[PDB]
Enzyme design. Structure first.
Site, mmCIF file in Angstrom:
data_model
loop_
_atom_site.group_PDB
_atom_site.id
_atom_site.type_symbol
_atom_site.label_atom_id
_atom_site.label_comp_id
_atom_site.label_asym_id
_atom_site.label_seq_id
_atom_site.Cartn_x
_atom_site.Cartn_y
_atom_site.Cartn_z
ATOM 1 N N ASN A 172 -25.329 53.671 22.623
ATOM 2 C CA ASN A 172 -25.836 54.268 21.399
ATOM 3 C C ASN A 172 -26.333 55.691 21.631
ATOM 4 O O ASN A 172 -27.024 55.952 22.610
ATOM 5 C CB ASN A 172 -26.957 53.420 20.799
ATOM 6 C CG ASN A 172 -27.226 53.761 19.348
ATOM 7 O OD1 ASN A 172 -26.571 53.233 18.442
ATOM 8 N ND2 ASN A 172 -28.187 54.657 19.116
ATOM 9 N N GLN A 194 -34.120 50.481 14.068
ATOM 10 C CA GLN A 194 -33.407 51.581 14.704
ATOM 11 C C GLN A 194 -32.706 51.162 15.984
ATOM 12 O O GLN A 194 -33.198 50.328 16.755
ATOM 13 C CB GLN A 194 -34.348 52.748 14.986
ATOM 14 C CG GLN A 194 -34.958 53.311 13.724
ATOM 15 C CD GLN A 194 -33.931 53.939 12.791
ATOM 16 O OE1 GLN A 194 -33.219 53.228 12.049
ATOM 17 N NE2 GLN A 194 -33.831 55.272 12.833
ATOM 18 N N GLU A 287 -43.843 65.063 9.318
ATOM 19 C CA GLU A 287 -42.511 64.459 9.199
ATOM 20 C C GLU A 287 -41.885 64.667 7.819
ATOM 21 O O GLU A 287 -42.431 65.352 6.955
ATOM 22 C CB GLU A 287 -42.552 62.950 9.565
ATOM 23 C CG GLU A 287 -41.958 62.567 10.963
ATOM 24 C CD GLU A 287 -40.468 62.181 10.972
ATOM 25 O OE1 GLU A 287 -39.675 62.662 10.129
ATOM 26 O OE2 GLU A 287 -40.091 61.379 11.865
ATOM 27 N N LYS A 403 -30.178 48.299 7.308
ATOM 28 C CA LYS A 403 -30.714 49.402 8.057
ATOM 29 C C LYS A 403 -30.356 50.777 7.446
ATOM 30 O O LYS A 403 -31.214 51.705 7.376
ATOM 31 C CB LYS A 403 -30.159 49.354 9.480
ATOM 32 C CG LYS A 403 -30.327 50.661 10.241
ATOM 33 C CD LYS A 403 -30.029 50.522 11.735
ATOM 34 C CE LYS A 403 -30.169 51.875 12.439
ATOM 35 N NZ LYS A 403 -29.195 52.854 11.919
#
Ligand SMILES: Cc1cc2c3c(c1C)C(C)(C)CC=[N+]3c1c([nH]c(=O)[nH]c1=O)N2C[C@H](O)[C@H](O)[C@H](O)COP(=O)(O)O
Ligand SMILES: Cc1cc2c3c(c1C)C(C)(C)CC=[N+]3c1c([nH]c(=O)[nH]c1=O)N2C[C@H](O)[C@H](O)[C@H](O)COP(=O)(O)O
Ligand SMILES: [K+]
Ligand SMILES: [K+]
Ligand SMILES: [Mn+2]
Ligand SMILES: [Mn+2]
Lengths: 511, 510
Positions: A172, A194, A287, A403
């Site tokens: 990944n 994640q 963020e 997801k």
């Protein structure tokens, strides 16, 4: 020559296009790098290459470690504002975003994939210089403090974590934040669902969650960092999609101290062990929804860096998230949009009616507009509630999208007169076509996105349940009458004859 | 020069300021006037003064009837985008809207009012020329067809209806749309709970509903057409408030064929009888939320015109509603905000905490943002659902606001870091600070606004109940912790010291 595959060709195209400013004036990693980049994002100025950062005296090789490129995915101010995004994929820089998305969707069929090819260490620039664990001291590098209230210096905002499953079936590549914990160590987010967590969960399941091999790669091939930011499927090796996108195998080399493969062309590679057995403080960060909440604290796993390889005069790309628009919008939202288009595409019902989806940046990637072809909508013989139940089950709960859409909190169904990419059109439709609350179907048994401010500062963080809705902005009769009409009351909504006479002769009216 | 009291001064000051474009080339009232005005609002162009409308050859006096002024309450392209709204009140043209609203609010105290003054007919320019009933043919005047699919040619889009109650206690000046029905007739909207209705209702009460005297005035003093669009209270006579705002009595004169008073400085006055028991087709219209729905259909009452007075070279100002921004946003929305702000000013709880309120035009005037002082909010020892009920009940159900706030379907509570006049800031806070549905308090018994397209094309048009919510974009802890802390991650959110970057910007990018 090839900005899809070579970070430094990416930089050179931007320079050629007049969309890069080298800054030779000393700038302080403490707070100024972030102010500058922010002013760049917000006014759509050129991407700043910072050549002269204020250096700590004990830094082991300051002439090489490191410069900062900022705003790599920020919007451009003259032509196609999404130039930088098109460039990551080596496309024509005027390729607009809707088409950039079609290109990614187009290349999602695995038949297009091309796996990476190993090459020898001398084909990789970052293999020229090495630091051992003893020589490494992350404290001394010019790692920025991007926002007031950030709980550390966030060294990892635009590099790529390479993690591989124990059985080697899935490698990944993804982006996740990371801050310096101590001389030899980085901590960052590792949360459900994640992939950095999925993959490391596997090492845990086998009792080796203290010694999970990782590489952390800066200045990787721009197509690689784009996909690193895209939620392609569970189990999917990003490298193979990146290859198709580039019609060319990503050249990769083996690490020095583990058997992970990393791209030949990086600026810097960090190698070590993700330690999921020790928690440490990872500080709040400013963020994607535009806040830093300085008192928000939580614990996160620890990446122990044992090695670093880096090229001459290394450049680190950086993202400094906040208000729109920035990489946490163009890439996090754009690429959620692209994957959701692909997945919807493959849905036997939703593929007949859904023309496009996009995350308006104005909404900080909390909204997903869904553009519906009303003509095909009539054929389905459906209604608002039932289409909304289908959409939300699919996007919020399916094994396909559970997801992918996890960051999304409101899905907005609109008819096909609205260019969903133009926010003036989306906001008109949203306020004028849905009854507050009544035309919002609430899903209570879905996982909320823990970063949403309304969740992080509210009860949704304790409960961990609900918070999402699907809002239908399509008039009841658009579901039943295919000849339903309204005139939209702007200039472009006048009859073609009228617009043409008026436009052609505007100088005669407005002299 | 007095732009508050005299329309022609208003025009002259925009000319003086470079915000007027005399158009001498022939423009057609069929769709073209509308298309030109739409482009000018949307690109914030100079206001178009059409000097040469294509005339029907049978018009009785084309050198005088009429010219059109477009975009009187549109946004300007160069300085204070709200300069036209300021000049309606006679303020410095750079007065920002927040300050325009403060001005309206400051002058709502009845102490401040000043009733109008009667002046003789030879003081009124519109008394120079006259038309009797036999002479009148509204179908030969260059009235525009403003949007494709409009049911008729809408002559009344920026004029003022004058109606007085039988007992002469209340005289209302207001804008309601009206189209030409026939050579002698206008039909217009008269719907609940608008004063055109409340005041004509009274006559229907008294059984004399077929002969309600009316005047309809165009190019009225800009302060008056501005208040003509503001929901001041039931039973309140607008002339008084307008005089207060102008610090001068509005000069008025008496109509020729009835005893109504009309402003002395108008371009054209129409006079006649509102017939509440003759209902005729009042065809759809391109309206304030962006839509013309061509096969929406209702019937409405009839204004029979018996007399027209007008001046040399009469100008008709017009409003061509649709997408933001136009008069149905700056005036309808801005003045609902202004009156709301004042009424909130008289509430013993809400005035401690509310700093401002505004209808952002991007929400087509369906939204009210309400900016709450956070420190004073803590002192109330309250929470989201209590404050929502309080605020929602007051704006939707109180005798003070039931009408004022009728157009609004979503009220949005935000803290005081958010400049509610900058939509970039408001939409940030909306999307990021309310959980969808959980943080919306529905009201199902209140009267919906029937024009709102989700209502008109939905069941709310039938059920006439609900459609509204109050949405909290204030974090729970903002209600209890006064020192609640968050950093806004834009440039302006960095420490004041990190001036260094702004003052030295050329050293970075240079
Ligand atoms: C482009 C981008 C995406 C961020 C992001 C950032 C950037 C620049 C930062 C670096 C500025 C800071 C934080 N972000 C994180 C993040 N995902 C995550 O789990 N934690 C994060 O902290 N992502 C989102 C993440 O990259 C996407 O969800 C990918 O799909 C992850 O890969 P995966 O699907 O392989 O898990
Ligand atoms: C500025 C303005 C306001 C419109 C308006 C328009 C403009 C330009 C038009 C002409 C573009 C078309 C329609 N509008 C109507 C309307 N009110 C109403 O009841 N019917 C209407 O048709 N108004 C709103 C109305 O004038 C305000 O609600 C006033 O408060 C009504 O006056 P009142 O308070 O005395 O009843
Ligand atoms: K990824
Ligand atoms: K009024
Ligand atoms: Mn992945
Ligand atoms: Mn009134």
């Amino acid at each position: 020559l090839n900005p899809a595959l070579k970070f430094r060709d990416f930089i050179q195209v931007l320079k050629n296009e007049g969309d890069l400013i080298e800054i030779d004036t000393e700038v302080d990693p403490n707070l100024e790098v972030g102010a500058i980049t922010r002013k760049a994002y917000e006014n759509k100025l050129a991407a700043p290459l910072f050549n002269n950062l204020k250096q700590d005296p004990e830094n082991i090789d300051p002439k090489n470690l490191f410069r900062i490129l900022g705003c790599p995915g920020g919007l451009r101010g003259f032509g196609n504002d999404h130039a930088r995004i098109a460039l990551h994929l080596g496309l024509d820089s005027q390729t607009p975003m809707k088409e950039i998305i079609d290109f990614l969707v187009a290349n999602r069929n695995p038949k297009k994939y091309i796996p990476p090819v190993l090459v020898p260490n001398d084909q990789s620039p970052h293999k020229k210089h090495h630091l051992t664990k003893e020589q490494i001291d992350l404290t001394k590098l010019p790692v920025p403090l991007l926002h007031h209230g950030d709980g550390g210096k966030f060294i990892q905002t635009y590099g790529m974590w390479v993690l591989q499953t124990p059985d080697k079936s899935w490698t990944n590549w993804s982006i996740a934040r990371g801050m310096v914990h101590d001389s030899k160590s980085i901590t960052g987010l590792v949360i459900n669902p994640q992939h950095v967590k999925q993959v490391s969960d596997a090492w845990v399941a086998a009792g080796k969650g203290d010694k999970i091999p990782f590489a952390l790669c800066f200045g990787v091939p721009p197509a690689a960092i784009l996909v690193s930011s895209m939620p392609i499927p569970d189990g999917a090796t990003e490298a193979e999609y990146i290859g198709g996108l580039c019609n060319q195998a990503v050249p990769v080399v083996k690490c020095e101290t583990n058997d992970l493969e990393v791209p030949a062309d990086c600026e810097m590679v960090f190698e070590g062990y993700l330690d999921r057995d020790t928690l440490v403080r990872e500080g709040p960060f400013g963020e994607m929804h535009g806040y830093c909440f300085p008192k928000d604290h939580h614990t996160q796993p620890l990446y122990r860096v044992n090695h670093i390889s880096y090229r001459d005069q290394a450049i680190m790309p950086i993202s400094n998230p906040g208000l729109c628009t920035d990489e946490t919008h163009t890439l996090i939202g754009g690429l959620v949009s692209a994957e959701t288009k692909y997945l919807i595409s493959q849905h036997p019902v939703l593929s007949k009616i859904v023309e496009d989806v996009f995350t308006p940046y104005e909404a900080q990637a909390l909204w997903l507009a869904v553009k519906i072809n009303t003509h095909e909508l009539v054929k389905l013989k459906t209604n608002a509630k039932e289409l909304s139940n289908l959409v939300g089950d699919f996007l919020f709960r399916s094994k396909e999208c559970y997801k992918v859409c996890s960051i999304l909190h409101e899905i907005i169904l609109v008819g096909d007169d609205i260019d969903i990419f133009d926010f003036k059109q989306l906001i008109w439709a949203y306020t004028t076509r849905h009854t507050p609350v009544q035309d919002q179907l609430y899903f209570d048994d879905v996982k909320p996105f823990a970063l949403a401010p309304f969740a992080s500062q509210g009860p949704l963080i304790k409960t961990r349940q609900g918070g999402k809705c699907v809002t239908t902005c399509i008039f009841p009769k658009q579901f039943t009458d295919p000849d339903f009409e309204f005139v939209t009351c702007n200039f472009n909504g006048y009859p073609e004859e009228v617009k043409n006479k008026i436009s052609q002769n505007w100088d005669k009216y407005y002299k």
